[PDB]
Amino acid sequence: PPDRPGDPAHDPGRGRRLGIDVGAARIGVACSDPDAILATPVETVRRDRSGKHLRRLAALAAELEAVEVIVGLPRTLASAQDAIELAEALARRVSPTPVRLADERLTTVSAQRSLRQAGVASEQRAVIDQAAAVAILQSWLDERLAAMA
Amino acid sequence: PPDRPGDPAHDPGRGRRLGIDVGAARIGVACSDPDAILATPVETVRRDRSGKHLRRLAALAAELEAVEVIVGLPRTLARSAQDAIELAEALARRVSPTPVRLADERLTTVSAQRSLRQAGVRASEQRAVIDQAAAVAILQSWLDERLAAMA
User: Fold this and answer.
1) Of A9, A16, A18, B95, which has the highest C-beta tally within 10 A?
2) Which residues of A touch B40 (CB under 8 A)?
3) Are the CB atoms for B92 and B18 separated by under 8 Å?
4) A138 and B140: CB-CB below 8 Å?
5) Matching CDD domains, A to Z (chain B)?
6) What CA–CA distance (Å, rounded) separates A95 from A88?
7) A135 CB burial (10 A radius; 0-12, 13-18, 19+)
8) Is residue A7 domain-resident?
9) Does some domain include residue A10?
10) CA distance A89 to chain B (A)
11) Closest CA relative to residue A99, chosen from A2, A14, A28
12) Domain at A21, CATH number
């Protein structure tokens, strides 16, 4: 189940958010401004079997003083499973900072990723993963402010 | 009519693109990396009757060495096409020879997203920077479409 943006039971209030798109080999990362309005692309983290990506993702949360971390949740058919496993591993690592699952279905991110795949050079493939992170994070921020109003 | 991303007849090859979302009071600005892959927010420019905003947009195009400037084109009914067209034409005279192109907003959900943000704005802090989100979305659409057209 995706989490609900701006849920009062979970919302930590104002501050920078981190947003994460979990790819097969690379993880796109975005962050918000301190007032949690606007997503900006940050970096593409290399996914490695030994989990060094979890160390970098937790370092980024610390570096940006993130109050909330958002991970894209793809639809179960399609994997959700990989996103959930990263979200859970990261949640343990960055506690007490909360990690929330953003429903990808509220965006066109899955279509967009599929368009870039067919269009996208290796360096470019890397950096373009941040565009998904921005889109998922922006959705969360937009939905959150809407829910709060 | 919107321009066609990656049109081999007009494409200038490699370089940073500036992206622009034309609001009634505020203009959001975004820009790409030099390889025209990824849109990042730049700033919000206050619109004003005296045309100062046109000067600031040209300033950004020069500073970021834009090889192309992309303006969001909304539908003719509705933000209105005519507003965006007018700004695009005025901007084109100032950034020449840099070409100014019109990106079809209908290939994105930018119109819905802006409505949602407007509805949710309850603070000046939000209203400042929020227009950059539409600029990023429209510009990223241009970049995605361009890459796919060229592939």
Assistant:
1) A18
2) 40-41
3) no
4) no
5) YqgF (cd16964)
6) 11
7) buried
8) no
9) no
10) 28
11) A2
12) 3.30.420.140
